[PDB]
């Protein structure tokens, strides 16, 4: 019985591979071969945010491109004013080993997650004026990898237990559970429509998930190591995934296959964070070589190099308006570029 | 500059002062990681060393030095990912029950994987061989011998500089020294002088566990100073 099922699964995989290969009429490197080059994009450190007592691991931009929240393993979440470089709020975390943070789109709540296996949502608009714990979302049998808010009431979380869940802050229960992956999920990526999201795990594959139906429709492969980062294209029809193989790949949801590959013989360090610009022309990705290289989304040419940090770049975030970019590292600094 | 901006800058300076004050407690507190298999008696040490849950924090103070010991909870066996967070720590407390001759190979493989990690290349490992009484009983009863698991036990000889304890038979001493040598064989591998293991013998009733960890942390800090302060 099981043998026939495995044979049928292998046949279906072969058919999917043949179908993806049949639709490969032309590669992206051939159509965009006549486009004008991007040149060299030089970025200088405009603001230098410091104050964290430990390594900075995660950061996220809210709706307003002026506010910024960063997560550090010291147990403190500081809201940074990118323009005045002033510390707005200080949230003393109960668990110091935090690994991710999220900023709600309304700007009223923020979430965090780490080895505590509990996603704690902090309310910033409390009438008492002090930041307190709103809800302690527990139930994940593993460390939390990444969290992202869909709206002011719903939030999706990822954990290393190979399972994802959709939480409701109103009641504090999992409304949808995803158990299709075969490895620890590392990062999430919400579409601009907030209706679909694709995530990557250590299984060297990324699967597109549905918020309502709660079922995976497409499975992307091609990586040779664990996928640590993932980011969706501004339009919402494609996404990129970073892995420790020092090779970033671009996947399209409509084509259901890879379109371009970003790699260089000089880069051998793994990828930690990947992000896109406002229009998606420039692809920024963080590497373990203490630098952050910018890649051309249409030509795969390195448009610049950011070597303003002295330690591993652990996170990367671009504002909603593309005015400035933030890069965090384990050296307890968070510098702003442009 | 408006008054609201000045008040915000004042609040930022107050937050910076609070962070500077918290630094005095963060940098002085030493963080330690507690690892071990399910059969390991690390729970007995945690319960006695008080001088869907995730990370478990255990704090104790000895000789005016605050120590923070963390134990992993429901996280899966996929260690290569979440182990990167516990880097830069003072030491990693590795407890293994040497009395279970069956699962010694798994413990040795885990110790080799931890010692040969890319990120823990500069982090020392404190080895504690817990449950020495059960090991003594098993090796003296003659029911299960170590030769049935390791073929080198029949060819190993007790070192000359081995100082046995009073009231202990030569067989128990030979067995424990063979285990210590088997562990040191993997500890010294790929050492490069950047991290050294500290084999130590302890038990569930041994109340001197806090002093051994204190001495190990002192030695590690001394070595780190000798390296950084240009003395090695």
């Amino acid at each position, epitope marked *: 019985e099981l043998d026939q099922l495995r044979q049928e699964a292998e046949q279906l995989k072969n058919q999917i591979r043949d179908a993806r290969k049949a639709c490969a009429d032309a590669t992206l490197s051939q159509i965009t071969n006549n486009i004008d080059p991007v040149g060299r994009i030089q970025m200088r450190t405009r603001r230098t945010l410091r104050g964290h007592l430990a390594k900075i691991y995660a950061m996220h931009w809210g709706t307003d491109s002026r*506010l910024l929240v960063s997560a550090s393993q010291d147990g403190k979440l500081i809201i940074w004013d990118s323009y005045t470089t002033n510390k707005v709020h200080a949230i003393p975390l109960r668990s110091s080993w935090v690994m991710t943070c999220a900023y709600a789109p309304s700007g009223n709540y923020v979430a965090c997650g780490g080895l505590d296996n509990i996603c704690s949502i902090y309310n910033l608009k409390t009438r008492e004026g002090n930041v307190r714990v709103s809800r302690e979302l527990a139930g994940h049998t593993g460390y939390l990898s990444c969290c992202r808010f869909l709206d002011d009431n719903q939030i999706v979380t990822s954990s290393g237990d190979t399972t994802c869940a959709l939480w409701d802050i109103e009641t504090g229960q999992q409304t949808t559970t995803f158990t299709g992956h075969t490895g620890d999920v590392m990062s999430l990526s919400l579409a601009p429509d907030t209706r679909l999201f694709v995530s990557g795990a250590c299984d060297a594959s990324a699967k597109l998930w549905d918020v309502r139906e709660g079922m995976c429709r497409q499975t992307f492969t091609g990586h040779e190591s664990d996928i640590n980062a993932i980011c969706f294209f501004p339009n919402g029809n494609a996404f990129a995934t970073g892995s420790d193989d020092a090779t970033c790949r671009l996947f399209d949801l409509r084509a259901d296959q890879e379109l371009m590959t970003y790699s260089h013989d000089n880069i051998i360090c793994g990828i930690t964070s990947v992000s896109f610009s406002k229009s998606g022309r420039l692809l920024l990705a963080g590497y373990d070589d203490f630098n952050c290289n910018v890649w051309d989304a249409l030509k795969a040419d390195r448009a610049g190099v950011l070597a303003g940090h002295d330690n591993r770049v652990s996170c990367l975030g671009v504002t909603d308006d593309g005015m400035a970019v933030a890069t965090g590292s384990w050296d307890s600094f968070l510098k702003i570029w442009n | 500059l408006s008054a609201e901006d000045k*008040a915000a800058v004042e609040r930022s300076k*107050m937050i910076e002062k609070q962070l500077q004050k918290d630094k005095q407690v963060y940098r002085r507190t030493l963080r330690l990681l507690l690892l071990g298999a399910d059969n390991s008696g690390k729970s007995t040490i945690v319960k006695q060393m008080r001088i869907t849950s995730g990370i478990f924090e255990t704090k104790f103070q000895v000789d005016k030095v605050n120590f923070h010991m963390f134990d992993v909870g429901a996280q899966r066996d996929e260690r290569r990912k979440w182990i990167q967070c516990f880097n830069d720590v003072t030491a990693i407390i590795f407890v293994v029950d040497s009395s279970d001759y069956n699962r010694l190979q798994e413990a040795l493989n885990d110790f080799k994987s931890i010692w040969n990690n890319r990120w823990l290349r500069t982090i020392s490992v404190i080895l504690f061989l817990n449950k020495q009484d059960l090991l003594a009983e098993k090796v003296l009863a003659g029911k299960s011998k170590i030769e049935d698991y390791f073929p080198e036990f029949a060819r190993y000889t007790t070192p000359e500089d081995a100082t046995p304890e009073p009231g202990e038979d030569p067989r128990v001493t030979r067995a424990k020294y063979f285990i210590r040598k088997e562990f040191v064989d993997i500890s010294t591998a790929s050492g490069d002088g950047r991290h050294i293991c500290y084999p130590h013998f302890t038990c569930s009733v041994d109340t001197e566990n806090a002093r051994r960890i204190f001495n190990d942390c002192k030695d590690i800090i001394l070595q780190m100073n000798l390296r950084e302060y240009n003395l090695v």
Partner: single-chain antibody, 230 residues
Framework: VQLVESGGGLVQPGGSRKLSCSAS????????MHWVRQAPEKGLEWVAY????????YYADTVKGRFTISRDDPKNTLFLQMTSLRSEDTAMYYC??????????????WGQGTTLTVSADIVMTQATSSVPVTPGESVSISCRSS???????????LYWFLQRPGQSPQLLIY??NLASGVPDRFSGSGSGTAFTLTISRLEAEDVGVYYC?????????FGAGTKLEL
């Protein structure tokens, strides 16, 4: 949040009296304290200001030197040592909390206040002192300032307060931005020198006096007050 002032009474001219306010239900250490007086049948006037941790203190030109402000964060109480009282210092003082950060709403809560029956500055002016209006009709209140409140950062430091008969002032607008708890019927818009407060639809509970205030500089100055008659 609740502020209960104490220490009021009949004091002869030249005496000494210390007002005490008890804070509870919020972080008294994080919020700054303000003292605003209200003479009988008159407008509001800023007295003094103290920041968090007693790091920044300011007094008005009419009370500088005589009165001193002090706070007790451990006990969560505010003190106002009022020395050398004058015959014109008779007024009801209100204790107001405030916090300063991006997106804050200073002067959000007004205490009950206590009465003390004794015995360049941006001067605000309102051309309309009393405007009798009918219920349901859209009311529009205009304000005028002598100095442009538009700072280089682009923020407009204008505050609107509504003090109903027998109640403490309530913050309506702190910067177009609507304060928490205030219905969406209120709306504010204007230029750097001209400001207008428009009400979408007046109700029976909207009666009272509207006081304007500028926060461009430390010496806060209030307006004359526009009262609406039902």
């Amino acid at each position: 949040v609740q502020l209960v002032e104490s220490g009021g009474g009949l004091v002869q001219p030249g005496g000494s009296r210390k007002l005490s306010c008890s804070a509870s239900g919020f972080a008294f250490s994080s919020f700054g304290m303000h003292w605003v007086r209200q003479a009988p049948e008159k407008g509001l006037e800023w007295v003094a200001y103290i920041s968090s941790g007693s790091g920044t203190i300011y007094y008005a030109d009419t009370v500088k030197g005589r009165f001193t402000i002090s706070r007790d964060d451990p006990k969560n109480t505010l003190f106002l040592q009022m020395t050398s009282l004058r015959s014109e210092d008779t007024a009801m003082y209100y204790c107001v909390r405030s916090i300063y950060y991006y997106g804050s709403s200073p002067f959000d809560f007004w205490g009950q206040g206590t009465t003390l029956t004794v015995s360049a500055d941006i001067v605000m002016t309102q051309a309309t002192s009393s405007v009798p209006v009918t219920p349901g009709e859209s009311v529009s209140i205009s304000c005028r300032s002598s100095k442009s409140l538009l700072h280089s950062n682009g923020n407009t430091y204008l505050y609107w307060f509504l003090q109903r008969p027998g109640q403490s002032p309530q913050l309506l607008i702190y910067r177009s931005n609507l304060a928490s708890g205030v219905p969406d019927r209120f709306s504010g818009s204007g230029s750097g020198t001209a400001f207008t407060l428009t009400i979408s639809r007046l109700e029976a509970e909207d009666v009272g006096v509207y006081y304007c205030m500028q926060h461009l500089e430390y010496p806060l100055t209030f307006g004359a007050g526009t009262k609406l008659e039902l």
